[PDB]
């Protein structure tokens, strides 16, 4: 079997951007950690778990049809200081994510090939999931109160 | 088997700080478990009972080198009011214990002995890692405010 | 509620008392062990734990009535070379502070106060206990011999195994 | 408490290192299954864990000295084809990061700074041990030949249950 | 990769003492064994097991550095009649390795080899805590008496775990 | 009660064989457990505490006689490259054993001491067998091959199941 060199591009593309956003999301977690902010670090763990599961699907989808997986590039790593900076980038690597996965879904079911429209479906509906997520606490964050909201997320154990 | 007066000095030292540090970190704790914030308490008993640790085996150690080990003399303990001095002492006190490992690390390993370099790297790695939560601490209180931490930190929970 | 000043340094005077015996009872279980000796050893320090709990409930108590303990006194610390000098030197710290406790339960009675009496009456007891115990050991190895006595707690026997 | 950026740097070119490694090790055990021969795959997953373990005591280790731990450079990654290109591969990075870690210890113990040569030794001592291991496989496939090595780790059986 | 020969050397210096030492202390277990004194055997049969893996790990460290180990020479053992005899022996033989060991700790940290050295310090702390309880046990029977420290190693052992 | 000085010569001898034997067997179990050879180092390992054990019960009953063990000196320990080599000094060893054991059994029978004969007896039975081992050991690697052979021994010290 041999697929297209279009639907590798995408498939390498989506893999380099989700490289990018384990490495992203690894050092925040580290940092909120340092800070004292424990439940926040654990959620963020949990996150950079779950996407390189996702890079781990990625790359054994592309071995199988017979392409060369890209590891040496990745994109942009931006950190923040406050936590509004972490959730406003998260915001946005996740956003450009779910709109490269549509492009591509359309382009993929147009070429006659589904199992690889399967695997973006399910990435898809996972970052839309975390998109929410991100977003809600956001404007939480933003009724509340900075200080109120770090006060109720520290433990000091 | 008799080590250099010098090493057997810096071990004595090193012993009379951490005493002085138990006695200051017990002291402490006792002070805010009387106020009400439990967790605090909890916490500041950990660490006391760490720094006896620290003491017992520098006893040990110098007990071994055929030494006088003196529990006599104290250094200057020091007590707070309110949360923030009384982590500003903790912060200063194993400040000063530090710049004294390290030196004593450096002219120990210089005089040819190992296994009291070996105690002395374990104890700095141990209050490196205390003084780098007294900091985080410090700023944590610094940014929310005496009275939110203050209330976070209250328990309320006893049994009757 | 506050307390008379007396009350105070007499809780004060205690305490220092007990962290001097705490201090001198683990140097001598450090220095037994390292000795040899190693039944003398585990009961030394089981006694110094026990100044220990004194030394805490006091400065409990002293908390209580708006007082403030202090940790920076300290009296003088007496070692021994053998035996005989350690069990003298225990036997002196504790007959200084059966003494000074009576002294302070008859005033702290006499000015209408009970609680702290009480805790007194109770480290009274605990500290009569331990001289009792000096006493009959030292009795004990002056009869029967020194090195006779020592060749009794000194053992390496597989004692693990039960 | 600070850091001069001697150690600092040092720090951040060993964590640049050991995730370079990571992205190699990953790729070549995923590589190595697609392949057909498992153990090799297992084997390489676990060192891919250890030097994940690495990677996260470095940056642990750089944000305790109050630094600033870089997440965007990344060295040359090299991929081979058949089994001796890859521990040619694994052999030369280990080599490289054993030269390194030697230089930054040296030049950070004579600066006054303990922890850090700690943990650079024990990174050290990691990494000899998997270089050595990759030095016997070599000569163990080259004494043996290609195919016949390849014969002893391939196996036929349905998704493993773990 | 490969070591130079210094290190080499010294590795198999120190293998060569603790065969040496091995030698000895199981020889002296059993003459002790023979003889009726119990506890004293199997406490040597103990040091000699640590012995053992003092020269295991001693002869996996120097087969890393692609050397030769050294199982063919021997020093000198000397045996003895009385207990005090045995106790000066060990007694030299430890002093001997601690003088050798840290002058190749000196040597081998002083030209960038740090897992050799580590390894050294481990054994250095090992026997600096052998030869402690050799002296205090010597003092111990100097001061009770040859008879009647024997005493109290007879019998009397009852090892009963359950 | 003490034996003659020739029962005591022999034993000693025997003793100073076995403790040759069991550093030869450690050592080559060390170096093929490094090679990658694990369960030759395993077998090498087993053969090694077996003499071990051999040598501790030799100086026990030499002992019991009122004698003077020797543990200083010792014979000539060689060592191999290739599996052949080490099954050729091994066999030789053992070889060298079996013959010292037939003849001090006979000579110390004859001189009205038992038990020693008896022990003479077990480690001639244990001798025995190994060196069977050994010689079908080399029987097979000739058969086979050098590379069959260690492709059939090696294996992968994964670790993670
Ligand atoms: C990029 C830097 C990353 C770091 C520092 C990191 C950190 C970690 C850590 C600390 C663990 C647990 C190790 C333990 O508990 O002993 C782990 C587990 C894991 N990582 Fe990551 N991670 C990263 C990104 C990745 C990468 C690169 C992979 C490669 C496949 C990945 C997939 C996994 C998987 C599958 C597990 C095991 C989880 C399980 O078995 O349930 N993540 N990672
Ligand atoms: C000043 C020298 C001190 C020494 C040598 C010392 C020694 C010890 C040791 C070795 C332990 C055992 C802890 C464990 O096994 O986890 C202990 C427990 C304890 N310490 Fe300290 N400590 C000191 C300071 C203090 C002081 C001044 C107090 C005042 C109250 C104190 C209160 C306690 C208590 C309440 C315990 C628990 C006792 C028990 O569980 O029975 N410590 N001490
Ligand atoms: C030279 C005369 C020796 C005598 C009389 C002797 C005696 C013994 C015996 C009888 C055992 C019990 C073995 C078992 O229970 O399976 C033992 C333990 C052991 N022996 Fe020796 N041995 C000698 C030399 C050696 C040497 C040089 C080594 C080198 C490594 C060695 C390796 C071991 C090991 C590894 C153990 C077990 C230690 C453990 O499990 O942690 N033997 N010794
Ligand atoms: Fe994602
Ligand atoms: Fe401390
Ligand atoms: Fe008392
Ligand atoms: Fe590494
Ligand atoms: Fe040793
Ligand atoms: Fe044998």
Same mark, same amino acid.
């Given at each position: 079997? $041999?697929?297209? %060199?279009?639907?590798?591009?995408?498939?390498?593309? $989506?893999?380099?951007?989700?490289?990018?956003?384990?490495? $992203?999301?690894? =050092?925040?977690?580290?940092?909120?950690?340092?800070?004292?902010?424990?439940? &926040?670090?654990?959620?963020?763990?949990?996150?950079?778990?779950?996407?390189?599961? /996702?890079?781990?699907?990625?790359?054994?989808? !592309? =071995?199988? *049809?017979?392409?060369? %997986?890209?590891?040496?590039?990745?994109?942009?790593?931006?950190?923040?200081?406050?936590?509004?900076?972490?959730?406003?980038?998260?915001?946005?690597?996740?956003? +450009?994510?779910? #709109?490269? *996965?549509?492009?591509?879904?359309?382009?993929?079911?147009?070429? /006659?090939?589904?199992?690889?429209?399967?695997?973006?479906?399910?990435?898809?509906?996972?970052?839309?999931?975390?998109? #929410?997520?991100?977003?809600? $606490? &956001?404007? *939480? !964050? +933003?009724?509340?109160? +900075?200080? *109120?909201?770090?006060?109720?997320? !520290?433990?000091?154990?």
């Amino acid at each position: 079997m $041999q697929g297209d %060199p279009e639907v590798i591009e995408f498939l390498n593309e $989506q893999l380099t951007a989700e490289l990018t956003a384990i490495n $992203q999301y690894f =050092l925040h977690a580290k940092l909120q950690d340092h800070k004292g902010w424990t439940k &926040l670090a654990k959620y963020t763990r949990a996150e950079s778990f779950d996407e390189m599961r /996702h890079a781990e699907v990625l790359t054994d989808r !592309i =071995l199988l *049809l017979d392409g060369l %997986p890209n590891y040496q590039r990745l994109f942009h790593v931006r950190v923040g200081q406050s936590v509004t900076e972490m959730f406003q980038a998260d915001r946005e690597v996740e956003l +450009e994510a779910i #709109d490269r *996965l549509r492009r591509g879904i359309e382009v993929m079911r147009a070429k /006659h090939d589904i199992t690889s429209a399967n695997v973006f479906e399910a990435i898809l509906a996972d970052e839309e999931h975390h998109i #929410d997520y991100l977003e809600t $606490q &956001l404007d *939480l !964050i +933003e009724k509340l109160g +900075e200080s *109120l909201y770090l006060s109720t997320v !520290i433990e000091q154990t």
